[PDB]
Amino acid sequence: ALLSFERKYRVPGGTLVGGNLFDFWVGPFYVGFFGVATFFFAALGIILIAWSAVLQGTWNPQLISVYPPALEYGLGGAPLAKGGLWQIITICATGAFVSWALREVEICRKLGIGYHIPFAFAFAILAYLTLVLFRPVMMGAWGYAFPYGIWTHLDWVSNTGYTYGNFHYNPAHMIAISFFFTNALALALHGALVLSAANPEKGKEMRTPDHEDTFFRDLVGYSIGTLGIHRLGLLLSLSAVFFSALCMIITGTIWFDQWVDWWQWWVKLPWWANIPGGING
């Protein structure tokens, strides 16, 4: 159950709550107060979904789905069978998500490392809270949130999107996609670079970071560097999710008309606003 070099790291301490009450492991898993906290929220949350399953009349992952309250209930609670379950489950989900983060913080203090990991995660939890909490609360209705269902949730994207025409025009959506694409380009390269150095042509000796910098300089003229690319990767990702939450928080709140229309400000600018020719007039 232990990696050859692990015992020296399993010292007591680092916990945020409850001293050494839960300071111990289960196989490879570290526990702690938050280990228990999540098990709870998750166990309970699964149960609620199973229950929501019987009411629907199906035990098929492909069809099960827990819909939120209808726009009629606004922001108040709703009956279990009519949006209440989704509400309770959402609390349990949020509960499981915050706990997992906080649990990592403890794992961090025991190993004496940075907190970059749980911090990056908090960015995802934020995207989720934007969709099920902040946006809905600002639009006065849990009904605008998305449903917990494999396909039913893809339906929500399709509709929510097309409600504003081709979502492709949401400017923040564009920036967001850009970062996502870039991130993958970056990950591709980073992974391929380290591997081509650690695994050089047959028989040759292991290359060095010098060869790595050389390679990219030769190729594109610049090399971000071994520390830079890791700063870059963290940044591209978090930026991508940040802009995702932003393209959505503004949609349905400060802008509810067709997104494609929004671009008229640019074209309507006085200077060229009436000039003949082009694609506009």
């Binding site: 050859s4 015992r7 020296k8 680092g14 289960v26 025991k110 292991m206």
Partner: protein, 240 residues
């Protein structure tokens, strides 16, 4: 039909890919062991991968993983329970003994060479051409500890020549001796360099290096390990 074929092929493929990726990630740390260090009964579904051999450059030899795993150093720890799963306590000074957040690994006692076979890290005074180009220059500034006490002075910046990056700060202690501090564990301020992980009385405790113009992999590990553990172990003295 095609699509339906294309898709099953993919799933089968993707499973072998995972399999492969999993065993590749088992070249270090395996096989597993019990808390007493004997081979653990269950090792999981995935088997060990066949050995591979790296040809370290500069005549440095070879490396073959997976291979015999050994801490090659003593571990001052004692069990705190009659069963598996519990913390193992430090039977001495965790900082001094190198356990927990202050652990270090027994890496080669040589320095990392750059592409040409030269030392990768050198004090800046020996780095011809190197100079501080941006930001505040730490050389000359006093060093404060988590207890708001001055512990020494920065007398140089050790730099990474090929990556051209500041890596360690050389600090002079009360007895005119120096120690190395991780660039990552310090806060360079207007008129001082603040070190949170350690209290003034712990600086002399930082491991020292044999030669004054180079650090070996082993030495960096003990140095960084020691400093990082101060976060947990210095805490009593750390204030603010």
């Amino acid at each position: 039909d095609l699509a339906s074929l294309a898709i099953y092929s993919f799933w089968i493929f993707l499973a072998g890919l995972i399999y492969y990726l999993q065993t590749e990630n088992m070249r270090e740390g395996y096989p597993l062991e019990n808390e007493d260090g004997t081979p653990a009964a269950n090792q999981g579904p995935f088997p060990l991968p066949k050995p591979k051999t790296f040809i370290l450059p500069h005549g440095r030899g070879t490396l073959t993983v997976p291979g015999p795993e050994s801490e090659d150093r003593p571990i001052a720890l004692a069990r705190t329970a009659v069963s598996e799963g519990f913390p193992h306590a430090p039977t001495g000074d965790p900082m001094k003994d190198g356990v927990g957040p202050a652990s270090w690994v027994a890496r080669r006692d040589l320095p990392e060479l750059d592409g040409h076979g030269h030392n990768k890290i050198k004090p800046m005074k020996a780095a011809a051409g190197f100079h501080v180009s941006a930001g505040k220059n730490p050389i000359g500034l006093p060093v404060r500890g988590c207890d708001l006490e001055i512990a020494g002075k920065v007398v140089d910046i050790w730099v990474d020549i090929p990556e051209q990056m500041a890596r360690f700060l050389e600090v002079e202690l009360k007895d005119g001796s120096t120690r190395l501090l991780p660039m990552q564990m310090v806060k360079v301020q207007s008129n001082r360099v603040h070190v949170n992980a350690l209290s003034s009385d712990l600086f002399a405790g930082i491991p020292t290096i044999k030669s004054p113009t180079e650090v070996t992999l082993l030495e960096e590990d003990k140095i960084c390990g020691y400093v990082a553990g101060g976060l947990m172990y210095a805490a009593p003295k750390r204030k603010s």
